[PDB]
């Protein structure tokens, strides 16, 4: 059950959707992509901090969940409870298979 993302790191296939033809995919562990004071008006927060990926790879939904939580705990620690709006801007749509062996 481990199947560490070593196997499924590189992009190596034609992008699957959750389609009419692939059914029953396990739901991505990450589900909610906005954290913090996400009702804020634009005039409030004049600073946007990005994060760009410098490698062509695949990122796992499980990893996205861990990352989002880990980056929210610290920034709650510093800024506060209504000090930010963390918005994951990437979405897991490309499913991956696993060939069970006997």
């Amino acid at each position: 059950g481990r199947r560490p993302a070593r196997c499924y790191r590189y992009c190596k296939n034609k992008p699957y959707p959750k389609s009419r033809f692939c059914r029953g995919v396990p739901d991505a562990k990450i589900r909610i992509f906005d954290l913090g004071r996400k009702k804020a008006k634009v005039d409030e927060f004049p600073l946007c901090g990005h994060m760009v990926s410098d490698e062509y790879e695949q990122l796992s939904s499980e990893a996205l969940e861990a990352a989002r939580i880990c980056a929210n705990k610290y920034m709650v620690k510093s800024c506060g409870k209504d000090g930010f709006h963390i918005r994951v801007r990437l979405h897991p749509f490309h499913v991956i298979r696993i060939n069970k062996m006997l």
């Binding site: 994060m51 062509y56 490309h94 499913v95």
Partner: peptide, 21 residues
């Protein structure tokens, strides 16, 4: 058969944008 669900990045993507003061 389906298992897990991933996202594909691109050199120059933006995986996380935080807004604040």
């Amino acid at each position: 058969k389906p298992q897990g669900t991933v996202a594909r990045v691109h050199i120059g993507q933006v995986i996380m944008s935080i807004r604040t003061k």
